[PDB]
Amino acid sequence: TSARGQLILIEGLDRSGKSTQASILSTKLSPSKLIKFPDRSTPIGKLINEYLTNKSFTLSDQAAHLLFSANRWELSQQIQDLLNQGYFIILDRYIYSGIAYTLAKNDFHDETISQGKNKQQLNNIDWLLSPDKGLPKPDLTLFLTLDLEEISKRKGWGDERYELQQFQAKVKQCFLEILDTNKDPTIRIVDVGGKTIDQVTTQLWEIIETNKNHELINDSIQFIT
């Protein structure tokens, strides 16, 4: 069919290096757009931002999970169009963040993070995934993994709802549980413990340059199933 750019997703915990490497990679990729999730500029995004930033605000975990997926569906069409025009697209967070942050509440009791004692559907990975099905699949997913101790040493803690170490630990496990690189070879878990900014960039670039994710291709856009 025709030429297109590629979709490259960076996942990870807070302060794992995602926005830093996303910008650096927008620079190496050309032409390139950078999209952040959640997109707090959209109308659903502003709700999500209330939820994350005003910790008195009330919303069931299932409602919240659905808002995050709806927010991606606000951008889906635009993403496809840009890719098909030959743009390279860097995502900072996406469907893996969606599943993992919600999945982690399932055995976690903290009235701020997870409202109420019932955890209905919060361990059902298929329910959690189903609203993101049909969204564009990244051509490459890069998961940046790191020690909680190393994260605690960096600037960037912002007092949002999920920014609690005991919860972040559960989220770390949930991410490694849903990221299976044998069942899906588009996924690359990259250990960034004790690596500088440039060393990370060099590793990230090598993975990209080797699979040729920086070059146009004649494949169609894959979709999440």
Ligand X SMILES: Cc1cn([C@H]2C[C@H](O)[C@@H](COP(=O)(O)O)O2)c(=O)[nH]c1=O
Residue 97 interacting entry, from ligand X, a copy of itself, ligand ADP, none, C-beta within 5 to 8 Å by type: ligand X
Least spacing, CB of residue 222 vs ligand ADP, in Å: 25
Does the annotation place 161 within a ligand binding site? no
Query: Of 108, 110, 111, whose CA–CA distance to 171 is shortest?
Result: 108
Length of the chain: 225
Interaction pattern, residues 155-184, with a copy of itself; x per rule: CB under 8 A: ------------------------------
Check whether 143 is labelled as a binding-site residue. Answer: no
Tell me the closest approach of the beta carbon of residue 81 to ligand ADP, in angstroms. Answer: 26
Output the six-digit token pair for 149: 């101790």
How many CB atoms are located within 10 Å of the residue 190 CB?
19
| One of 1, 58, 158, 198 touching Mg ion (CB under 5 A) | 158
Q: Candidates 9, 47, 75, 101: give the one binding ligand X (CB under 6 A).
A: 101
Window 2 to 61, contacts with ligand ADP (CB under 6 A) = 12, 14-20
What are 131's strand-pairing partners?
Answer: none
Q: Cβ contacts of residue 207 below 8 Å, gap of 6+? A: 140, 142, 188, 190, 213
Residue 18 CB partners (closer than 8 Å, separation 6+): 10, 11, 12, 92, 93, 144
Q: Which residues bind ligand ADP (CB under 6 A)?
A: 12, 14-20, 154-156, 195-197, 200
